[PDB]
Design an enzyme around this catalytic site. Structure first.
Site, PDB file in Angstrom:
ATOM      1  N   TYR A 101      -0.909  15.574  -7.524  1.00 17.06           N
ATOM      2  CA  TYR A 101      -0.721  14.966  -6.209  1.00 17.06           C
ATOM      3  C   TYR A 101       0.467  15.496  -5.408  1.00 17.06           C
ATOM      4  O   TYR A 101       0.717  15.052  -4.285  1.00 17.06           O
ATOM      5  CB  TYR A 101      -0.636  13.448  -6.336  1.00 17.06           C
ATOM      6  CG  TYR A 101      -1.962  12.777  -6.614  1.00 17.06           C
ATOM      7  CD1 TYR A 101      -3.019  12.892  -5.723  1.00 17.06           C
ATOM      8  CD2 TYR A 101      -2.151  12.024  -7.762  1.00 17.06           C
ATOM      9  CE1 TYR A 101      -4.229  12.270  -5.969  1.00 17.06           C
ATOM     10  CE2 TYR A 101      -3.353  11.403  -8.020  1.00 17.06           C
ATOM     11  CZ  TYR A 101      -4.390  11.525  -7.123  1.00 17.06           C
ATOM     12  OH  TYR A 101      -5.590  10.901  -7.382  1.00 17.06           O
ATOM     13  N   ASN A 194       7.220   8.041   5.340  1.00 16.10           N
ATOM     14  CA  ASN A 194       6.877   8.565   4.026  1.00 16.10           C
ATOM     15  C   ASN A 194       6.505   7.540   2.973  1.00 16.10           C
ATOM     16  O   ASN A 194       7.037   6.432   2.941  1.00 16.10           O
ATOM     17  CB  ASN A 194       8.035   9.407   3.483  1.00 16.10           C
ATOM     18  CG  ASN A 194       8.466  10.487   4.440  1.00 16.10           C
ATOM     19  OD1 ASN A 194       7.809  10.738   5.449  1.00 16.10           O
ATOM     20  ND2 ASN A 194       9.572  11.141   4.126  1.00 16.10           N
ATOM     21  N   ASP A 200       6.187  13.509   4.376  1.00 12.94           N
ATOM     22  CA  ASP A 200       5.027  13.163   5.193  1.00 12.94           C
ATOM     23  C   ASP A 200       4.584  14.308   6.102  1.00 12.94           C
ATOM     24  O   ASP A 200       5.359  14.792   6.919  1.00 12.94           O
ATOM     25  CB  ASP A 200       5.340  11.931   6.042  1.00 12.94           C
ATOM     26  CG  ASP A 200       4.166  10.976   6.142  1.00 12.94           C
ATOM     27  OD1 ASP A 200       3.608  10.595   5.094  1.00 12.94           O
ATOM     28  OD2 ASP A 200       3.807  10.594   7.274  1.00 12.94           O
ATOM     29  N   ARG A 228     -12.585  13.453  -2.503  1.00  6.67           N
ATOM     30  CA  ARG A 228     -11.934  12.160  -2.660  1.00  6.67           C
ATOM     31  C   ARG A 228     -10.637  12.298  -1.876  1.00  6.67           C
ATOM     32  O   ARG A 228      -9.727  13.015  -2.284  1.00  6.67           O
ATOM     33  CB  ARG A 228     -11.614  11.862  -4.127  1.00  6.67           C
ATOM     34  CG  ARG A 228     -11.573  10.373  -4.481  1.00  6.67           C
ATOM     35  CD  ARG A 228     -10.338   9.653  -3.927  1.00  6.67           C
ATOM     36  NE  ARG A 228      -9.082  10.182  -4.452  1.00  6.67           N
ATOM     37  CZ  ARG A 228      -8.015   9.443  -4.743  1.00  6.67           C
ATOM     38  NH1 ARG A 228      -8.042   8.134  -4.577  1.00  6.67           N
ATOM     39  NH2 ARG A 228      -6.917  10.015  -5.206  1.00  6.67           N
ATOM     40  N   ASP A 230      -7.137  11.119  -0.576  1.00  4.71           N
ATOM     41  CA  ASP A 230      -6.077  10.234  -1.028  1.00  4.71           C
ATOM     42  C   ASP A 230      -5.327   9.577   0.131  1.00  4.71           C
ATOM     43  O   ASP A 230      -5.165  10.167   1.204  1.00  4.71           O
ATOM     44  CB  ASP A 230      -5.104  10.999  -1.934  1.00  4.71           C
ATOM     45  CG  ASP A 230      -3.937  10.149  -2.393  1.00  4.71           C
ATOM     46  OD1 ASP A 230      -4.145   9.259  -3.243  1.00  4.71           O
ATOM     47  OD2 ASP A 230      -2.804  10.392  -1.925  1.00  4.71           O
ATOM     48  N   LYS A 233      -5.220   5.357   4.060  1.00 10.57           N
ATOM     49  CA  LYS A 233      -4.647   4.214   4.761  1.00 10.57           C
ATOM     50  C   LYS A 233      -3.278   4.613   5.305  1.00 10.57           C
ATOM     51  O   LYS A 233      -2.653   3.876   6.074  1.00 10.57           O
ATOM     52  CB  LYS A 233      -4.489   3.044   3.792  1.00 10.57           C
ATOM     53  CG  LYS A 233      -3.587   1.937   4.292  1.00 10.57           C
ATOM     54  CD  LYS A 233      -3.354   0.887   3.222  1.00 10.57           C
ATOM     55  CE  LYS A 233      -2.887  -0.416   3.843  1.00 10.57           C
ATOM     56  NZ  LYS A 233      -3.332  -0.540   5.263  1.00 10.57           N
ATOM     57  N   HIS A 234      -2.821   5.791   4.897  1.00 10.93           N
ATOM     58  CA  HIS A 234      -1.525   6.284   5.302  1.00 10.93           C
ATOM     59  C   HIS A 234      -1.575   7.480   6.233  1.00 10.93           C
ATOM     60  O   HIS A 234      -0.610   8.230   6.353  1.00 10.93           O
ATOM     61  CB  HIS A 234      -0.654   6.523   4.070  1.00 10.93           C
ATOM     62  CG  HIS A 234      -0.445   5.285   3.257  1.00 10.93           C
ATOM     63  ND1 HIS A 234       0.376   4.259   3.672  1.00 10.93           N
ATOM     64  CD2 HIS A 234      -0.993   4.876   2.089  1.00 10.93           C
ATOM     65  CE1 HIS A 234       0.349   3.285   2.781  1.00 10.93           C
ATOM     66  NE2 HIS A 234      -0.479   3.632   1.813  1.00 10.93           N
ATOM     67  N   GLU A 258      -9.454   6.700  -0.306  1.00 10.02           N
ATOM     68  CA  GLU A 258      -8.845   5.628  -1.071  1.00 10.02           C
ATOM     69  C   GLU A 258      -8.033   4.719  -0.159  1.00 10.02           C
ATOM     70  O   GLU A 258      -7.016   5.122   0.401  1.00 10.02           O
ATOM     71  CB  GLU A 258      -7.951   6.188  -2.172  1.00 10.02           C
ATOM     72  CG  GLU A 258      -7.288   5.123  -3.013  1.00 10.02           C
ATOM     73  CD  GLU A 258      -5.887   5.509  -3.411  1.00 10.02           C
ATOM     74  OE1 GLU A 258      -5.108   5.920  -2.529  1.00 10.02           O
ATOM     75  OE2 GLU A 258      -5.572   5.447  -4.615  1.00 10.02           O
ATOM     76  N   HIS A 328      -6.820   5.517 -12.395  1.00  7.57           N
ATOM     77  CA  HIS A 328      -5.499   6.042 -12.744  1.00  7.57           C
ATOM     78  C   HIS A 328      -4.328   5.205 -12.225  1.00  7.57           C
ATOM     79  O   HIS A 328      -3.189   5.415 -12.625  1.00  7.57           O
ATOM     80  CB  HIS A 328      -5.365   7.501 -12.257  1.00  7.57           C
ATOM     81  CG  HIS A 328      -5.685   7.675 -10.807  1.00  7.57           C
ATOM     82  ND1 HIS A 328      -6.956   7.509 -10.302  1.00  7.57           N
ATOM     83  CD2 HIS A 328      -4.892   7.950  -9.746  1.00  7.57           C
ATOM     84  CE1 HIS A 328      -6.936   7.689  -8.993  1.00  7.57           C
ATOM     85  NE2 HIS A 328      -5.697   7.962  -8.632  1.00  7.57           N
ATOM     86  N   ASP A 329      -4.602   4.257 -11.339  1.00  7.68           N
ATOM     87  CA  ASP A 329      -3.539   3.429 -10.788  1.00  7.68           C
ATOM     88  C   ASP A 329      -3.542   2.008 -11.351  1.00  7.68           C
ATOM     89  O   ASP A 329      -2.500   1.349 -11.409  1.00  7.68           O
ATOM     90  CB  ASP A 329      -3.610   3.414  -9.257  1.00  7.68           C
ATOM     91  CG  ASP A 329      -3.046   4.677  -8.633  1.00  7.68           C
ATOM     92  OD1 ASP A 329      -2.118   5.276  -9.214  1.00  7.68           O
ATOM     93  OD2 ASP A 329      -3.533   5.077  -7.558  1.00  7.68           O
ATOM     94  N   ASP A 371       0.947   3.031 -14.806  1.00 10.82           N
ATOM     95  CA  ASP A 371       1.166   4.456 -14.709  1.00 10.82           C
ATOM     96  C   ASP A 371       2.534   4.627 -15.369  1.00 10.82           C
ATOM     97  O   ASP A 371       3.447   3.863 -15.081  1.00 10.82           O
ATOM     98  CB  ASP A 371       1.215   4.846 -13.229  1.00 10.82           C
ATOM     99  CG  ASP A 371       1.864   6.185 -13.000  1.00 10.82           C
ATOM    100  OD1 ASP A 371       1.813   7.028 -13.912  1.00 10.82           O
ATOM    101  OD2 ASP A 371       2.428   6.398 -11.908  1.00 10.82           O
TER     102      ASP A 371
HETATM  103 CA   LIG Z   1       1.366   9.614   6.745  1.00 13.95          CA
END
Ligand SMILES: [Ca+2]
Ligand SMILES: [Ca+2]
Length: 683
Positions: A101, A194, A200, A228, A230, A233-234, A258, A328-329, A371
Site C-alpha cells: 500500500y 492525509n 496525499d 479494487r 483503496d 472515501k478519501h 473500499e 486484512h483490516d 493488523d
Molecule cells: Ca485524499
C-alpha cells in the site's frame, strides 16, 4: 459466449473471489526475496516481508488448491513498486511495505512480488484455469512522509516509470496535499488531508490526473480482470467518476472500491457513491451485520433480514455489492471455540446476493485479531476442513443456479436464531435454512416456498447437518426439525426460461460503447435491446449473454429491456448511466455565497452530469473548509470534456431553494486536463 465465461470481466455475480495478501501466502521463489531488515525468514516479525509472491500463487493454481476449492477469481495486493525503507515500529521493531500500500512507482512492479513477466505468467495461468485476476490499486497517496523531515522514509516520493516526479518535501509542483492530516471530523476533511502520515496525492493537479490514468492502463494492458480501489472515501467523488470513465472507455473491467462503514453504520454518501461513481463497493453493511449475528452476538436474525431488505432498497445494483465476513483490516472471523459460526457465515455469504470475496486462510480456520496479526503466513493447504468443503460445494452454485447469482432474496421463516430465505430468478429457486443456535433445535412449521412440489435433498450433502424436505402443490413444506447449528440448501434450476436480465455492466456508459446484458432465455437468434424505447445495435446475441452498442440518446439514466426474436419481452434493468461524453474533472468555486444556519450551496446546470437543472439532483452540498474557506465554496465535478456548460449555484435547506440571480455562468470544459472555474455569487 456465456455470462459465466472467464472472459466476462464486467460481471462477477457468478464468481467467488479469494483475497490474497501476496506476501503472506506462498514464497514461490526465494531468489526474489528482499534482503536484510526488509526480510524475515522466520515469519515472526509480522510487519516485514515474509517472501510470498506471484509464482507461489501460480503454484497453488497448478496444484489444484484454489481450483479444487471452487475459487473463480483472485484479488491480490497492489502489484506496483513500493518504498524499500524500513520504518520504525516499537512493537514489531520494523515496518515495511510488505502489504503493497506504499506506492513508489505505479508504472512498475514490486520486485519482490515478481517481474512483469512473472505477473503475466500469473495472469495467463489464472485464465488457463478459468480464474479472473483482481488487483488492489491505491491512487490516494504514495507512502508515509514528513514534509518537515525529508529523511523519514522515502519522502513519499513518486516516480514515473523510473524518473522521479517529486517528494512531499519541497513540493513546488503541488503533486501532493499539504493540509496536515485528517482527524475524520468531516467528509471533506478526510479527503484533502492525509490519512495518518501517508503523502496525499493531489489528483486535481493535471500531471497527477494524467499519470494515474496512464498508470492504470499499464495494468489493463497486462490483462487484469478487475480493480479494487483503496480508500475511495478519501478521494473526491468527482475525480473518481472522471477516473472511472477513463478506465471504462479504454477497457471496461469490474471495479469495486473500499468505503469503510462501521458497526450499525449507514452513510448516505456511501450509497450515493455506489450508485453514481461508475464503480461498485464492498458491502460493509453486509459484512458488519453478518459478524454481529454469527460472530459477536450483538444482533439477531431479525437484524440480518433488515440488512438484506434495506440494503436492497438503497443500492441500485445489489448484484454488484462485494460481500465478505472479514478481511486484512478486520479481526479474523474465527476467534476460537466452535468453527460452526464461520462455516454458517461462509454458506450464508456464498448463497446470498452480490459477489462473495473470501479472505485467504479462512477455510483453514486461521485466527488473528488486528493488523498485523490478521495477516499471518498461510498456515496449511489442507483440503479436509469442513470450511474448504462448504466452499467447494457452494461456490459452484453461483454458476449453475441463476437464482443464486442474480435472484432476489425473500425471508420465508424467521425467529431470533433461525433464518430461512429464498433466492429467486424467474422459475429458478434456492432456499436456505440456517440455525445459528448451537444447542437448540427448532420445529419449522408454516413454511412456504416457490420450489416446485417434490422432494429436495441437501445440496451440502448433510455436511452441516442439513437434510431433505418435501414441498406440496401449494408450495407448503412438510414440517421439519432444524437441528442446532444446521445449514441446509435446497434448489431448483428451471429447464426453460423466459427472457430475464440478471445483470448489466458496465453501469456507466456513453453512446457508441458496448455493454453486456446477462441473464437467461435470451434465445440464439437476435432480438432487440432497448435503452428506454430506443433500440441499440446488437454486437452479439446469446441465450445467456447479449452485447450491444449504446444508441445516441439524450444523456441520462436509462432502463434496459430485451425482446426475443419471438417478441418475448424481458424485465427491465434500470438506472444505467449514459454520459454526454469523455469525462473531465473540474473544480467549481463560488465566492461570496453566504448562507443562514444549516443551509448549503449546490451546483446545478446545463448537462446530465450537472443534474439538468433538477435542484433535487444538484451537486453538493459543496465543500468549504480545506482548499477554500467559507463563504467560498468549491467542488470537484466530473463533466463532459470540451463542452460549453451553463450553470448556476443555489442555496438549499429543506424548505427553500434560493437561486443565483442574473444570467447562467458559462464555461467550456477543457478537452484534456483538469480545470477550475471561479465565479462570484450573483444577487
Ligand atoms: Ca485524499
Ligand atoms: Ca519470494
Amino acid at each position: 459466449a456465456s455470462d459465466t465465461a472467464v472472459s466476462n470481466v464486467v460481471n462477477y455475480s457468478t464468481d467467488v473471489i479469494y483475497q490474497i495478501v501476496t506476501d503472506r501466502f506462498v514464497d514461490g521463489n526465494t531468489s526474489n526475496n528482499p534482503t536484510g531488515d526488509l526480510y524475515d525468514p522466520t515469519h515472526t516479525s509480522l510487519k516485514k516481508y515474509f517472501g510470498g509472491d506471484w509464482q507461489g500463487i501460480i503454484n497453488k493454481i497448478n496444484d489444484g488448491y484454489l481450483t479444487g476449492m471452487g475459487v473463480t477469481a483472485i484479488w491480490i495486493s497492489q502489484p506496483v513498486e513500493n518504498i524499500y525503507a524500513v520504518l520504525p515500529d516499537s512493537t514489531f521493531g520494523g515496518s515495511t511495505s510488505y502489504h503493497g500500500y506504499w506506492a513508489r512507482d505505479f508504472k512498475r512492479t514490486n520486485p519482490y512480488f515478481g517481474s512483469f513477466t512473472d505477473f503475466q505468467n500469473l495472469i495467463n495461468t489464472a485464465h488457463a484455469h478459468n480464474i479472473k485476476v483482481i488487483i488492489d490499486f491505491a491512487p490516494n497517496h504514495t507512502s508515509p512522509a514528513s514534509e518537515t523531515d525529508p529523511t523519514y522514509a522515502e519522502n513519499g516520493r513518486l516516480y514515473d516509470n523510473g524518473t522521479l516526479l517529486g517528494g512531499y518535501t519541497n513540493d513546488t509542483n503541488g503533486y501532493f496535499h499539504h493540509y496536515g492530516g485528517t482527524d475524520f471530523s468531516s467528509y471533506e476533511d478526510g479527503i484533502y488531508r492525509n490519512l495518518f502520515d501517508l503523502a496525499d496525492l493531489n489528483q486535481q493537479n493535471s500531471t497527477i490526473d494524467s499519470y494515474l490514468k496512464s498508470a492504470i492502463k499499464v495494468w489493463l494492458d497486462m490483462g487484469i480482470d478487475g480493480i479494487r480501489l483503496d480508500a475511495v472515501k478519501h478521494m473526491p467523488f468527482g475525480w473518481q467518476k472522471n477516473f472511472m470513465d477513463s478506465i471504462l472507455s479504454y477497457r471496461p473491467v469490474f471495479t469495486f472500491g473500499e468505503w469503510f462503514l462501521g458497526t450499525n453504520e449507514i452513510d448516505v454518501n456511501n450509497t450515493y457513491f455506489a450508485n453514481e461513481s461508475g464503480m461498485s463497493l464492498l458491502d460493509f453493511r453486509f459484512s458488519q451485520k453478518v459478524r454481529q449475528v454469527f460472530r459477536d452476538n450483538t444482533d439477531t436474525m431479525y437484524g440480518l433480514d433488515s440488512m438484506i431488505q434495506s440494503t436492497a432498497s438503497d443500492y441500485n445494483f445489489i448484484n454488484d455489492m462485494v460481500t465478505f465476513i472479514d478481511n486484512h483490516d478486520m479481526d479474523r472471523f474465527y476467534n476460537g471455540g466452535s468453527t460452526r459460526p464461520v462455516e454458517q457465515a461462509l454458506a450464508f455469504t456464498l448463497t446470498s446476493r452480490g459477489v462473495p470475496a473470501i479472505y485467504y486462510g479462512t477455510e483453514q480456520y486461521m485466527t488473528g485479531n488486528g493488523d498485523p496479526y490478521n495477516r499471518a503466513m498461510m498456515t496449511s493447504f489442507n483440503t479436509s476442513t469442513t470450511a474448504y468443503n462448504v466452499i467447494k460445494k457452494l461456490a459452484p452454485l453461483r454458476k449453475s443456479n441463476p437464482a443464486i447469482a442474480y435472484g432476489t432474496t425473500q425471508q420465508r421463516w424467521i425467529n431470533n436464531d433461525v433464518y430461512i430465505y429464498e433466492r429467486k430468478f424467474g422459475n429458478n429457486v434456492a432456499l436456505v435454512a440456517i440455525n445459528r443456535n448451537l444447542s437448540t433445535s427448532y420445529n419449522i412449521t408454516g413454511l412456504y416456498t416457490a420450489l416446485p412440489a417434490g422432494t429436495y435433498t441437501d445440496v451440502l450433502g448433510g455436511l452441516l447437518n442439513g437434510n431433505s424436505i418435501s414441498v406440496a402443490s401449494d408450495g407448503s413444506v412438510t414440517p421439519f426439525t432444524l437441528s442446532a447449528g444446521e445449514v441446509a440448501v435446497w434448489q431448483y434450476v428451471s429447464s426453460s426460461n423466459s427472457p430475464l436480465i440478471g445483470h448489466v455492466g458496465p453501469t456507466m456508459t456513453k453512446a457508441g460503447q458496448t455493454i453486456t446484458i446477462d441473464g437467461r432465455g435470451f434465445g440464439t437468434t437476435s432480438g432487440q435491446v432497448l435503452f428506454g424505447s430506443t433500440a441499440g445495435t446488437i454486437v452479439s446475441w446469446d441465450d445467456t449473454e447479449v452485447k450491444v452498442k449504446v444508441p445516441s440518446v439524450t444523456p441520462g439514466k436509462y432502463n434496459i429491456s430485451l425482446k426475443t426474436s419471438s417478441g418475448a419481452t424481458s424485465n427491465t434493468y434500470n438506472n444505467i448511466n449514459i454520459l454526454t461524453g469523455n469525462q473531465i474533472c473540474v473544480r467549481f468555486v463560488v465566492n461570496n455565497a453566504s448562507t443562514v444556519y444549516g443551509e448549503n450551496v449546490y451546483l446545478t446546470g446545463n448537462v446530465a452530469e450537472l443534474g439538468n437543472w433538477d435542484t433535487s439532483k444538484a451537486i453538493g452540498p459543496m465543500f468549504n473548509q480545506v482548499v477554500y474557506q467559507y463563504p467560498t465554496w468549491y467542488y470537484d465535478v466530473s463533466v463532459p470534456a470540451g463542452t460549453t456548460i451553463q450553470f448556476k449555484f443555489i442555496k438549499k435547506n429543506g424548505n427553500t431553494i434560493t437561486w443565483e440571480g442574473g444570467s447562467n455562468h458559462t464555461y467550456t470544459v477543457p478537452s484534456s486536463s483538469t480545470g477550475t472555474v471561479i465565479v462570484n455569487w450573483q444577487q
